[PDB]
Structures are given as structure tokens and as C-alpha cells.
Design a protein around this ligand. Structure first.
Ligand SMILES: Nc1nc2c(ncn2[C@@H]2O[C@@H]3COP(=O)(O)O[C@H]4[C@@H](O)[C@H](n5cnc6c(=O)[nH]c(N)nc65)O[C@@H]4COP(=O)(O)O[C@H]3[C@H]2O)c(=O)[nH]1
Ligand SMILES: Nc1nc2c(ncn2[C@@H]2O[C@@H]3COP(=O)(O)O[C@H]4[C@@H](O)[C@H](n5cnc6c(=O)[nH]c(N)nc65)O[C@@H]4COP(=O)(O)O[C@H]3[C@H]2O)c(=O)[nH]1
Ligand SMILES: Nc1nc2c(ncn2[C@@H]2O[C@@H]3COP(=O)(O)O[C@H]4[C@@H](O)[C@H](n5cnc6c(=O)[nH]c(N)nc65)O[C@@H]4COP(=O)(O)O[C@H]3[C@H]2O)c(=O)[nH]1
Ligand SMILES: Nc1nc2c(ncn2[C@@H]2O[C@@H]3COP(=O)(O)O[C@H]4[C@@H](O)[C@H](n5cnc6c(=O)[nH]c(N)nc65)O[C@@H]4COP(=O)(O)O[C@H]3[C@H]2O)c(=O)[nH]1
Ligand SMILES: Nc1nc2c(ncn2[C@@H]2O[C@@H]3COP(=O)(O)O[C@H]4[C@@H](O)[C@H](n5cnc6c(=O)[nH]c(N)nc65)O[C@@H]4COP(=O)(O)O[C@H]3[C@H]2O)c(=O)[nH]1
Ligand SMILES: Nc1nc2c(ncn2[C@@H]2O[C@@H]3COP(=O)(O)O[C@H]4[C@@H](O)[C@H](n5cnc6c(=O)[nH]c(N)nc65)O[C@@H]4COP(=O)(O)O[C@H]3[C@H]2O)c(=O)[nH]1
Ligand SMILES: [Zn+2]
Ligand SMILES: [Zn+2]
Lengths: 108, 104
């Protein structure tokens, strides 16, 4: 039946985008995969289908690595404000960079 | 003639740090390796032996990379103001991140 195509991992990372009310959002990722991510929304209304451009932020030691992304909201949990998102139009460099982060995180 | 321990490449990258004049420096790299980098000095005096804490920045596509690093000036060509620098005590995670980015 339905199958998650990419493993989802809880590696430390942040999402930054401009949402409703032209308010910026800076939130901790609940999980991350080659296909998308999840985070906890912040008060401002958000609904499945909403589309945003933003930056994925990764920091370890004195490395900071950033990824500009387009994502569409695919689920919003009213109780927890959990928002689940799908990347749209990921460039091959981006895809590969994501997989590097995720492969390294898996197995240490 | 010496064999360079790390291979050097010419890619779009910049170095930022606070110089001797206490004013900011923001310069394009001449080249980069996992061991260090070079750039042309334009402002304040700078000499071999100087230590700085800086930020190495790279950006291609939607990808942006940044490494906070201590570096030591190894050489300065007084004529061209070419500065050659060596990274100080990088973590293996950081060297590996450099060797990755370079390999391209
Ligand atoms: N990946 C995923 N998709 C979801 C989920 N909830 C709804 N869907 C999607 O909506 C279809 C119907 O979901 P369902 O009503 O729970 O109806 C499901 C459900 O009754 C059952 N089922 C499928 N996988 C599982 C499972 O892992 N555990 C249990 N207890 N039942 C499952 O088979 C039916 C058909 O499933 P699918 O053909 O895959 O088609 C599913 C799926 O495409 C979810 O939690 N995870
Ligand atoms: N890291 C992360 N990515 C997210 C999240 N929400 C959406 N995405 C990404 O967006 C893809 C499409 O989401 P979908 O349309 O809801 O289409 C989904 C959805 O219908 C279903 N599904 C998968 N996992 C679940 C689940 O846990 N609960 C429910 N109800 N459905 C699920 O399976 C389809 C395909 O799943 P994927 O192949 O993984 O493909 C997902 C995933 O790459 C999230 O919370 N975290
Ligand atoms: N439309 C959509 N919604 C998503 C997606 N991913 C997560 N969600 C929503 O976020 C809820 C929590 O996701 P979870 O923590 O991964 O917690 C999930 C997860 O651990 C598990 N699960 C459900 N489907 C799958 C699957 O297809 N593959 C795997 N590995 N786990 C699944 O079941 C738990 C509860 O799933 P849900 O009741 O459906 O509750 C999910 C769902 O409402 C997605 O891809 N598409
Ligand atoms: N001044 C200097 N430059 C270095 C040194 N090591 C590498 N290079 C530079 O790297 C280029 C390619 O080096 P190579 O692969 O060894 O490729 C070189 C190498 O195979 C060979 N070669 C040139 N000089 C020598 C030498 O003195 N001893 C040996 N065994 N081979 C040499 O000729 C190839 C083309 O030489 P180039 O046109 O000059 O282009 C050289 C040269 O610009 C060095 O130790 N000193
Ligand atoms: N103190 C110090 N100064 C450095 C260093 N690397 C570069 N420089 C200085 O900046 C010039 C190098 O520019 P290049 O593009 O690598 O172009 C270089 C380079 O391609 C080649 N080459 C010369 N020596 C070597 C070597 O020992 N090993 C290798 N692999 N190539 C060399 O010949 C060109 C001219 O080399 P130079 O006449 O020496 O002129 C050099 C030198 O004055 C360093 O590691 N330490
Ligand atoms: N990307 C880049 N990194 C730099 C530069 N200058 C210094 N570094 C980094 O700092 C290390 C020590 O530089 P060095 O003391 O001048 O000690 C140098 C230097 O004495 C010699 N050397 C290598 N290439 C050249 C050259 O082209 N010209 C001259 N005159 N000497 C060179 O080989 C030694 C070791 O060089 P490396 O193994 O590569 O190891 C170098 C390198 O990792 C630069 O201009 N560009
Ligand atoms: Zn299923
Ligand atoms: Zn030669």
C-alpha cells in the first residue's frame, strides 16, 4: 500500500521562512527526510496546501550549512501544531546534500 | 618544491574576519584546500604569524556553506598582497566537510 519513500530522521536542524502576516518563523525540525520535514507551528494560521520558500539550517561544531527550499504543507495537527511538509522542486545538488547529511546522521 | 598535503581549487568562496585596524575584512578567495586558503589583502597591514578568527563562506545554487575557523598567516607577497593562510585545529567533522565541498 502506501509507503514512506525516504527514512525520516530527528537530526538537529531549523527551518526559516516567512509565513502568514508576513511574520518570520524560526522553528526546530521535528524530523527531516529527502522528501520533506516537520516542525511545530507558531500561533499564526497555517493550512494544508500552503506553499512557502525558506531556508533549512544545519549546525555542527563551527560548521553552518544552509539550504533554500520550497515546501508545501501536507498536514497540520490542531492540538500539537505539528506541521508536515513536502519539498517542491529540489535541485540535484540540494538532494545530494540532504542525502549526505542524512546518511552521515544514520550510523553516527 | 613541496607536495601540498591537500589539493587546492579555485571556487566561489569568501573569507571574513576582523583585521588589525579592528575593521572588517571581506575578501574573495584565490583558492581553497582542506589545509587553508589564499586571498588578496586590500586594507590593514597583515604579516606571517598573524592569527585571526574568521568565517569561510561558500554559496552555489540554493546551497550556502559556512565555517568558523582560526587561521594563521603563512606568507604575504608584498608586491601582490597575496596572503596564504593555514587553518588551525579543525575538527575531523570540519575537515571532512571541507574535503567534501572541495571534491566537485
Ligand atoms: N503511509 C500512511 N498512509 C495513510 C495513513 N492514513 C491514511 N493513509 C492513506 O489513505 C489510505 C487509506 O488509509 P486507511 O483508512 O487507514 O485504510 C488503510 C488501512 O485500513 C490499511 N493499512 C495500511 N497500512 C496499515 C498499517 O500499517 N497498520 C494498520 N493497522 N492498517 C494499515 O490498509 C488501508 C489501505 O491503506 P493504503 O492502500 O496504504 O491507503 C491509505 C493511505 O494511502 C497513515 O497513517 N500512513
Ligand atoms: N520528514 C517528513 N516528510 C513529510 C512529512 N509530511 C509530509 N512529508 C513529505 O511529503 C511527501 C508527501 O506527503 P503526503 O502527500 O501527505 O503523501 C504521504 C502520505 O499520504 C503517506 N504517509 C506517509 N507517512 C504518513 C503518516 O505518518 N500519517 C499519514 N496519515 N499518512 C502518511 O504516505 C505518502 C507518502 O509519504 P512519503 O513518501 O514519506 O512522501 C511525503 C514526505 O516526503 C513529515 O511530517 N515529515
Ligand atoms: N498527510 C500526511 N500526514 C503525516 C505525514 N507524516 C506524518 N503525518 C501526520 O503527523 C502525525 C504524526 O506523525 P509520526 O509522528 O511520524 O507518527 C506516525 C508514525 O509513527 C506512524 N506511521 C503512520 N504511517 C506510517 C508510514 O507509512 N511509515 C512509517 N515508518 N510510519 C507511519 O503512525 C503514527 C501516527 O500516524 P498518523 O496517525 O497518520 O499521525 C501523523 C500524521 O497526522 C505524511 O506524510 N502525510
Ligand atoms: N614550481 C612547482 N610547480 C608544481 C610542483 N608540483 C606541482 N606543480 C604544479 O602542478 C602542475 C602539475 O604538476 P604535476 O601533476 O606533477 O604535472 C607536471 C609533472 O608531471 C611534470 N614536472 C614538471 N616539473 C617536474 C619536476 O621537477 N620533477 C618531476 N618528477 N616532474 C615534473 O610536468 C607536469 C606539468 O608541469 P607544469 O607545467 O609546471 O604544471 C605543474 C606545476 O604547475 C612543484 O613542486 N614546484
Ligand atoms: N610561503 C608560501 N607561498 C605560497 C604557497 N602557495 C602559494 N604561494 C605563493 O603564491 C604563488 C602561488 O600561486 P599559484 O597559483 O599556486 O601558482 C604556483 C603554483 O601553481 C606553482 N608551484 C610553485 N611551487 C609549487 C609547489 O611547491 N607545489 C605545488 N603543488 N605547486 C607549485 O608554480 C606557481 C608559482 O609558484 P610560486 O613562484 O612559489 O608563487 C606562489 C607563492 O609565492 C605556500 O604554500 N607557502
Ligand atoms: N589553498 C591554499 N592553502 C595555503 C596557502 N598557503 C598556505 N596554505 C595552507 O597552509 C599550509 C602551510 O603553508 P606553508 O607554511 O607556506 O608551507 C607550504 C609551503 O612551504 C609549500 N608550498 C606548497 N605550495 C607552494 C607554492 O606554490 N609556492 C611556494 N613558495 N611554496 C609552496 O608546501 C608547504 C605545504 O603546503 P600545503 O601542504 O598545501 O600546507 C599549507 C596550506 O594547507 C595558499 O596560498 N592556498
Ligand atoms: Zn501502510
Ligand atoms: Zn617542475
Amino acid at each position: 500500500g502506501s509507503q514512506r519513500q525516504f527514512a525520516r530522521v530527528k537530526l538537529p536542524a531549523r527551518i526559516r521562512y516567512i509565513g502568514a502576516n508576513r511574520e518570520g518563523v524560526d522553528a526546530r525540525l521535528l524530523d527531516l527526510s529527502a522528501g520533506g520535514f516537520a516542525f511545530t507551528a507558531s500561533g499564526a494560521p497555517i493550512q494544508p496546501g500552503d506553499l512557502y520558500k525558506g531556508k533549512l539550517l544545519f549546525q555542527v561544531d563551527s560548521i553552518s550549512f544552509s539550504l533554500e527550499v520550497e515546501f508545501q504543507v501536507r498536514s497540520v495537527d490542531p492540538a500539537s501544531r505539528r506541521v508536515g511538509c513536502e519539498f517542491q522542486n529540489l535541485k540535484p545538488r540540494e538532494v545530494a546534500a540532504l542525502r549526505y547529511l542524512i546518511t552521515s546522521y544514520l550510523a553516527g
